[PDB]
Design a protein around this ligand. Structure first.
Ligand SMILES: OC[C@H]1NC[C@H](O)[C@@H](O)[C@@H]1O
Ligand SMILES: [Cl-]
Length: 1025
């Protein structure tokens, strides 16, 4: 029952953008004519006649489904299968059940798209703000009702005499290939529309000497790769000479066949649509690139190596790029599961927003058990360095160093206190994670799906049971390709090789995900790490990142660095650093559908892997977790939709200015691809100094690395550490190892910790409403200058999520930057200094300042007028981990100067993920706040959308720019008292000794502080006279 659909697989190898050319037309079919095929529910069918562009007398018939997916959010969907019947996926971002839920709801509200065919056979329908006509050859024209402006239309190619063929729908003749494609008109060079293409996940793009946000005029591919430094040599163009730089035509770790189009930007007629081709074979997005004749300036396309063809167009409910992102998250939502909290993504435990240090190259938990080796370091020493210098420090990412000789799910004796492996909870022999708990830390460990196979007698229960229950990927293929064999076997198993450099390597077996039982089995292994204290998950080598291998060499032998190349191609022998593309893996896209060669679904392996860890690991064994029941996953690769499993770090970056640039750009682009909780390794993972690899990050690059990343969602300093036993990496990178910059380093980490609720609320808003935490400058509407500023300017936070403006310095040894403040609003310079001094005057939005001064101790960060920001301090004044905070450590609602005599605020509150009752039982609180001025009276109002988590400690209002009132009155459900001046005269005295109902005139920071009881938080009217 392998290969149910009778497909002949024509390509297995990596076909770069340079070899993908649907606009060529040769051997390609495109829609030439149709007749109507009925409408059931909201899915129309058109019976489309496809014609070979370069000889239209050759024609085939395939039905194409046209389904409206949301009336209120203006999204519909084209879908056909060139190779067989149209099939609903059973795994992926877009599920039928969620589409059904959305439709059923909008139908109950009497939404009517009025899908109809005309006399002529043209399908017409309408969404809320748009109307669509699709002609005979499937020519498509999408119009916005309010101004009658055509916002999107697909491409038509002419023939000699056979009429116009719609490249809106294309597939390669199956006598010659398997590729699909879809082409639109591209208005990038229109004088008025100036169309720009955004999104596309982790892709990097250089312009002159700089890494930029926009993705216009370039040819990209998704092909999840083990792409160290984002510029792997085998990923080079044909006949490329000299250094390969990271750039647009190089795949990354995450697969985002997703672009958001933006035209007429910063004007009253702005339009925005998202474009999603839902395919997990190698996929392409060309946004008007003439290089290698892969595209044409005036066309834009998407395509893939394999079928099926299934594509979403998503315009959003209303104005602006951001609205495209939230509508997209809804098609991917879990509303049909009745998720009270996790609608658009899964909420992490709060601790995920803390500062982590990871290291590849620790050799024990405690010093007393650290083996001798040049530059060896213990987990304990890192903890000390951070803790003793009073860093706000959350915990560790313990690498494969911890494992027993690379046996995933195991530990070795050195990573325990008593130097032997225990089964857990013995107060006389604590695991790394347990010991880490007592320091008030939480931990991830590295988990790959590489199940070591060369075991030299030594028993490994995980690889063993996989063999026994036949849950491994078999060594079958439709080509008779010999994947290699060892003396360990099994005979019919795919045996890959894991290689970490410097002779640290092993043979592996892998989970055949598509099988029943594999996910359950996978997930039940995590029991072995949860019961010894493991907090969350660091998913890695996800492709799987297998050692480069050429068919016909021993499993442990990799090819010459230079192979394959254009003169000496792969010709079906290279494994492109994962499974050899021909291996028959059990279908991951369609359950109980059979086996298919991996080439078909490369870009879904990591998704599935994350999926299984989240549902069979983290959720099913939630009981085996120790200190915190909720958990998370930081994954290296995945697909669109991966946000219901957890977040991402952007694999192996390096330690240069360019990589700071890229980090910010990846973060912005990843967010808008519906993956909010993402970030890059702070300081850069790999070595950078070509004369000596062990040279650590400089202090000025680390400062700027820290400052750019300090408000991004995932904040982990991680690096490859040179040790004697693994001789690649840098000497160190930990923040405390930078004595000259230590004070700045630490204060920017404090600053983040004070604004932990700003992060957390932003994440709630993402889980409930799909808003991206990080906003591109171009998401700010009615500004025609944010576009030029979009490489390094980004926003977040507050009630709307556009209250904080960041513009980090992105070059080393630099103390100026060109600053642009978004127009029609005011900004206030802020940062780690400003907690303890008054604000400077207001800065006028719409300002361009060249050479804006940014000394090293500073980053550019502004809080908008009308912002009220939930802010947290420690009661005792010392820096501690977020995960050891209680409600007694103050909440403070910082009221910034009023905008239009108004300010606004939002705080999500829950236990932090100690339990799972916020996402399971709706046990959480949303507090909102407002401030208004009206002559001599200011009114501060607390309301709740719901109050199901009880904030057990006193909270504060910090009014900036106010001093001594004549009276403050508080009104509340069970309270109505006038406030009295506190006999405390310092913030520290107010926190610890101040009375519920005290106020304090802070002259030092020009703020008035109200201390209020915990029970007035869900509802209050505070009036300042
Ligand atoms: O597992 C070792 C190593 N693998 C590659 C990952 O990107 C890196 O973060 C990790 O340290
Ligand atoms: Cl990966």
């Amino acid at each position: 029952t392998d290969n149910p659909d009778g497909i002949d697989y024509k390509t297995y190898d990596y076909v770069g953008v340079w070899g993908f050319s649907p606009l060529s037309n040769t051997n390609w079919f495109a829609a030439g004519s149709s007749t109507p095929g009925g409408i059931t529910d909201w899915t129309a069918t058109m019976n489309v006649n496809f014609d070979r562009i370069d000889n239209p007398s050759i024609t085939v018939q395939h039905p194409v489904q046209v389904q409206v997916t949301s009336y209120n959010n203006n999204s519909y969907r084209v879908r056909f299968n060139p190779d067989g019947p149209i099939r609903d996926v059973t795994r992926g971002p877009i599920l039928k059940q969620q589409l059904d839920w959305i439709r059923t709801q909008e139908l109950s509200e009497g939404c009517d798209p009025g899908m109809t065919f005309t006399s002529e056979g043209f399908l017409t329908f309408e969404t809320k703000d748009l109307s669509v006509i699709i002609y005979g050859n499937f020519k498509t024209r999408v119009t916005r009702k309010s101004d009658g402006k055509v916002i999107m239309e697909n491409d038509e190619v002419g023939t000699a005499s056979s009429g116009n063929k719609c490249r809106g729908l294309m597939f390669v003749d199956r006598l010659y290939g398997n590729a699909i494609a879809s082409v639109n008109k591209n208005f990038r060079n229109d004088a008025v529309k100036q169309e720009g293409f955004y999104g596309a996940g982790e892709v990097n793009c250089k312009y002159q000497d700089t890494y930029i946000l926009e993705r216009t005029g370039i040819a990209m591919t998704n092909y999840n790769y083990d792409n160290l430094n984002y510029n792997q040599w085998d990923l080079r163009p044909p006949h490329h000479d000299g250094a390969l730089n990271p750039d647009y035509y190089i795949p990354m770790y995450y697969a985002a066949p997703w672009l958001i189009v933006n035209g007429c930007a910063g004007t009253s007629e702005q339009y925005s649509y998202g474009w999603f081709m839902d395919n997990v074979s190698q996929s392409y997005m060309n946004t008007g690139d003439t290089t290698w004749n892969s595209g044409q300036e005036d066309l834009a396309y998407m395509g893939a190596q394999y079928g099926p063809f299934d594509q979403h167009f998503v315009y959003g409910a209303g104005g602006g790029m951001e609205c495209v992102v939230t509508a997209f998250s809804l098609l991917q939502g879990k509303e049909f599961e009745n998720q009270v909290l996790n609608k658009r993504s899964v909420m992490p435990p709060k601790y995920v927003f803390g500062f982590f240090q990871g290291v590849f190259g620790t050799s024990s938990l405690l010093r007393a058990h650290m083996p001798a080796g040049e530059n060896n370091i213990s987990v304990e020493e890192i903890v000390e360095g951070y803790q003793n210098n009073n860093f706000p420090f959350e915990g560790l990412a313990v690498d494969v160093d911890m494992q027993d000789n690379l046996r995933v799910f195991t530990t070795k004796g050195e990573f325990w206190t008593a130097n032997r492996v225990g089964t857990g909870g013995d107060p006389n022999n604590r695991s790394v994670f347990e010991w880490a708990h007592d320091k008030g830390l939480v931990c991830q460990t590295n988990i790959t799906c590489f199940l070591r196979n060369d075991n030299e007698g030594q028993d490994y229960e995980v690889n063993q049971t996989l063999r026994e229950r036949q849950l491994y990927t078999k060594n079958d293929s439709l080509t008779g390709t010999d994947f290699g064999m060892t003396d360990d076997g099994p005979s019919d198993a795919y045996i890959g090789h894991l290689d970490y450099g410097g002779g640290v390597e092993c043979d592996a077996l892998f989970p055949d995900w598509g099988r029943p039982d594999v996910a359950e089995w996978w997930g039940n292994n995590y029991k072995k790490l949860f019961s010894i204290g493991l907090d969350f998950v660091w998913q890695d080598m996800t492709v799987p990142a297998m050692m480069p291998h050429k068919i016909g060499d021993d499993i442990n032998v990799k090819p010459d660095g230079n192979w394959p190349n254009a003169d000496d191609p792969s010709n079906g022998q290279y494994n492109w650093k994962t499974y050899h593309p021909q291996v028959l893996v059990t279908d991951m896209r369609y359950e109980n559908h059979g086996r298919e060669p991996m080439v078909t679904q490369r870009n879904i392996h990591a998704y599935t892997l994350c999926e299984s860890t989240r549902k069979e690991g983290i959720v099913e064994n939630a009981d085996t977790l120790t200190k915190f029941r909720r958990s998370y996953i930081i994954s290296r690769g995945g697909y669109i939709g991966n946000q219901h499993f957890g977040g991402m770090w952007v694999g192996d970056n390096s330690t240069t200015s360019n990589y700071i640039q890229m980090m910010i750009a990846n973060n912005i682009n990843m967010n808008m691809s519906c993956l909010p909780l993402v970030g890059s390794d702070i300081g850069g993972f790999t070595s950078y100094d070509n004369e000596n690899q062990r040279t650590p990050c400089t202090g000025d690059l680390m400062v700027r690395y820290v400052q750019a990343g300090c408000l991004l969602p995932w904040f982990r300093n991680h690096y490859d550490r040179w040790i004697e036993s693994k001789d690649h990496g840098k000497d160190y990178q930990e923040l405390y190892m930078y004595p000259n910059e230590m004070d700045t380093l630490r204060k920017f980490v404090e600053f983040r910790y004070r604004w932990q609720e700003v992060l957390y609320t932003a994440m709630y808003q993402n889980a409930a409403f799909g808003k991206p935490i990080i906003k591109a400058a171009s998401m700010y509407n009615n500004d025609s200058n944010v576009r030029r500023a979009q490489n390094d300017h980004f926003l977040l936070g507050g009630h709307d999520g556009y209250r904080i403006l960041c513009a980090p310095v992105v070059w080393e040894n630099s103390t100026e930057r060109e600053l642009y403040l978004p127009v029609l609003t005011q900004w206030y310079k802020f940062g780690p200094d400003f907690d303890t001094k008054p604000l400077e005057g207001a800065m006028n939005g719409g300002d361009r300042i060249y050479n804006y001064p940014v000394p090293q101790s500073e980053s550019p960060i502004f809080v908008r007028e009308g912002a009220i920001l939930p802010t947290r301090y420690t009661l005792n004044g010392e820096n501690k981990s977020l995960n050891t905070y209680t409600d007694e450590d103050p909440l403070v609602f910082e009221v910034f100067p009023l905008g239009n005599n108004r300010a606004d605020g939002m705080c999500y509150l829950d236990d932090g993920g100690v339990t799972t009752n916020a996402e399971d039982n709706g046990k959480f609180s949303v507090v909102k706040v407002a401030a208004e001025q009206d002559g001599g009276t200011e009114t501060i109002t607390f309301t709740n959308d719901c109050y199901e988590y009880v904030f057990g400690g006193p909270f504060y209002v910090r009014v900036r720019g106010a001093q001594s009132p004549s009276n403050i009155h508080v009104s509340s459900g069970a309270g109505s008292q006038d406030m009295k001046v506190s006999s405390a005269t310092s913030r520290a005295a107010l926190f610890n000794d101040g009375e519920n109902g005290d106020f304090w005139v802070d002259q030092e920071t020009d703020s008035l502080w109200l201390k209020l009881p915990n029970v007035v938080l869900p509802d209050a009217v505070i009036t300042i006279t």
